[PDB]
Design a protein around this ligand. Structure first.
Ligand SMILES: CCCCCCCCCCCCOS(=O)(=O)O
Ligand SMILES: CCCCCCCCCCCCOS(=O)(=O)O
Lengths: 168, 168, 168, 168, 168
């Protein structure tokens, strides 16, 4: 590419894998969101929480794709695997699966940052710090808070209703 | 009628029966609404939920009556039977009876649509789709959601209070 | 009822009968209104006059139902008989039937007031005076005025058109 | 056509015929409108009623033409026959001829819908329901109302003046 | 008195007794209100509910006093006995005592009305109907509603908190 400068093939490839990870995450949240929209689950605040995360993850993928092009790398898309579950259980189960998901994304961001540092790619480092690293830390903190409040509330049916009504 | 065109006697008659069904439903909701207004029941959000439905059902009847005249059919009114109950029990009992009621209305709409299709009456089909079919589906979904949340909340007294306060 | 005070069973029952009378009246006006909406009758001002009365009568029933609950009485609904006619003839015929109807309602209000006085129920008396007695007197006066103008106008077709156009 | 999908030659041709019918109708209303503008007829409200219908019918033709192109069909125009009359008599005569005209259009819409259903063309069905079927039913109802009021008014000269002044 | 007309000594005296009853009631509500303001009770919504009633009852006394002067009667004040309790227990206990109190006031209003009717004093009757009778009925209905919801909520501590938070 006429514009490519200091952009390793290793980072280029890892960025493509990270796009797949973010779209997979977006797909997982779409599934979570619509599960809580079922008439036999019916937790609107939980549905909205997860639908908003689906959107955030899709936007993360787009930011990575934009950056890939800015650096002269080439987007390569792969199949997107379906989410790990068809049904997501309680709000507690769902929030637990979500924090596991976010931790996996965070670890992928950290690995990518380590790769960038090894490749001496300061633009990539800045990119990850500016748009991802603190976003993830904040989100994981929030999910941790939610998990603590959910568990505090487990009269489990009553607790699930109240959390959705008064927190989400 | 000078204006009547492609409007079968079968549809005309079924429309009159459907008006009776909708007014009966409106009457049932009036009864439900005032039951929850009793000093010994006292659930204002439940009262309002049912009173609003009484109004919706009456408006459905008026829309059918207007349409009947538009097609050159003739409104024929019949006695309106009183609701199936004098007292409606808990919010749960009431919501259960309401979803049964809505399903019966929905089935009547579906039968009328099938009749219209058999009579090749596309204006009637459009009329039912535009003003009734999706309305019913949405309402039944909402009642299903409510039922799930109500059952989740059954400390039954506490649950009934909280649902009325925080959902209705 | 924990709140019931100075509210006789006789008044409670008569209030329930009066609700039935008001809903019957509302039903009668719904029928009148849609009759004048027929393409072969087509008197929009007459249709609107009666449709508005249907609404007023329904609201009267709701006021009675609200009052019943306020006093600790219990609403009991009964079958609603269909209106006395399927077709209502001329504006004159219709207005004549309407004033007969209103007189019957007025007489029921007067009987209820007499019952309340015999039961020494001053809250009921105030209720009837504030919300019904003068309303009826005013409405009956208006119908009387209309009847006089209608009869004055009977070239009967011309007269019916002009009354609907210039008065209603 | 590169875009044509599920659009039968039968429907394409019937749509072209329907365009001819709508333009013919527009032409008929133009003639009616200007007849009532004659100094020896002079009924401005009748003139305006028919001129507005001429415009509506032309717009119907344009909607059909637009739809034809959207589906990849090809507009084919044919000669437009002149209206059935040069002079249109009374408002009554004119309104009678208009309702006959609208019924013929309505029947053509119904036939086209039946053709679409036989050809399993759901886009065409939606198109007819959304833009034509209820429009026709409403218009025919209105003309029926007018006819009833006109006939009620037949002192025929006086009646024709009053209808034009107070209704149109 | 130069203005006194149709105002019996019996009514005059009963009006003075009723003023004492209303001020006693105001005093009782002042006590209730400040009890719920105690640091070891601490239910702000209950405190406010009763403090507002103290004000309403004082205003009732002033209206009676104004009316007494309007009729040419003479205000005579008597000692005001302290409330029946120093401490008022739970919200439930308090609301129960309040409805007993309101019923006693209502009965006094009814007795006064009966006296007025026996004395053929229509101004007094109008006065009681306009300013007191429906006010009492409404208040008693509300207290009945509250009692039902309170009892529904009795985890008694949790229930008392939730009622104060979500209803009062
Ligand atoms: C325009 C009034 C027509 C009423 C027709 C009479 C049927 C009564 C059915 C109950 C209506 C209950 O309606 S509601 O508005 O009170 O909920
Ligand atoms: C955009 C014009 C297309 C006209 C097509 C020519 C057909 C003429 C039919 C009369 C139109 C009468 O139309 S009107 O507007 O005068 O009432």
């Amino acid at each position: 590419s006429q514009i490519r400068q200091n952009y390793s093939t290793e980072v280029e490839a890892a960025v493509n894998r990270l796009v797949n990870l973010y779209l997979r995450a977006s797909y997982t949240y779409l599934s979570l969101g619509f599960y809580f929209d079922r008439d036999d689950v019916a937790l609107e605040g939980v549905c909205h929480f997860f639908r908003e995360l689906a959107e955030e993850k899709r936007e993360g993928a787009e930011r990575l794709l934009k950056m890939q092009n800015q650096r002269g790398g080439r987007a390569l898309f792969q199949d997107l695997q379906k989410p790990s579950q068809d049904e997501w259980g309680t709000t507690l189960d769902a929030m637990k699966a979500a924090i596991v998901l976010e931790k996996s994304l965070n670890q992928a961001l950290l690995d990518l940052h380590a790769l960038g540092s090894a490749q001496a790619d300061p633009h990539l480092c800045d990119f990850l710090e500016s748009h991802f690293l603190d976003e993830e830390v904040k989100l994981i903190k929030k999910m941790g808070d939610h998990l603590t409040n959910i568990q505090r509330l487990v009269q489990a049916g009553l607790g699930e209703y109240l959390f959705e009504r008064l927190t989400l």
